[PDB]
Amino acid sequence: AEAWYNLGNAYYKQGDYDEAIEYYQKALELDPRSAEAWYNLGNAYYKQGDYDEAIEYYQKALELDPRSAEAWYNLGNAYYKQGDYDEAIEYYQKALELDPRSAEAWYNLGNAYYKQGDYDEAIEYYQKALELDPRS
Template identity: 45%
Template structure:
């Protein structure tokens, strides 16, 4: 009886929480349409505090900060939205506008055509999307196998057999791509510079030499951490250390 009561309370809290978030999102949208971007940000922030994360929520937060000319936060939230909804044209478009406001123009290290093709294929979908596609192809494989087993006409059996093998090969490929994409995701730890300007040091201490300077909105990759310091790498291959307060991680959902 006690377990049933706890389950009921849990379900009720989830329903109430969802309703509250829906109300907050609606109010935030109204604030945004009125040009009250700070109030909209407050409401979106409350939804995040309630534990809800979505591409739409981060996209709207990015729009609000962009309207307030806050480069770092706008890029941060657009990038977060892109992690949850890869290749979304609207997110990419708005992210491009925000990136044009950055002071740093870091050129990426050139990649070979093979590397570009590999990354384009692996990152075409997120690892969970590759996994969902693999599951769908597995169902298709089972259906095609059953069709091959029960059908009598030779032509239909041949089509069923080809479909069976085709879905099996594609399913295995999707599993492989999901694994490769997950490995890429796991080793990639992107962050956005949040300070207006920060000196990047050669060592994790305040007495070390500054090797270069970064500005708000620049995307970096965190390679390791030491106490309150992070070692970062930028797109052109340069590395250095900075205090953690100067950046915000993208994958801290």
């Protein structure tokens, strides 16, 4: 499962996301418990612009291991990219509960409120992002 996964990663790092999918699928046939392989499969679909597929595989990775602030953040991103701002907010909140110093999660939470026309809330979360990254 290791070589298949790293073979997938070598294609991923080049922007060859569909080749990466084939090899991540092979890694997961051998080790269906690999949160890493699920997560990176979801990343490959995200990069392919298939947010519904990314969400299914991120959900599976988060089922096996609900600890990465990064994984909740990327689940929020996938929902954001398909216009599901309620769900994006839910998952960005979960990300921030695990990593309050994520300027990225505060910023995207701002953006989700901005997209809903909630500019008062957007401004609150952009200000939090700027406390952590004042060079944003």
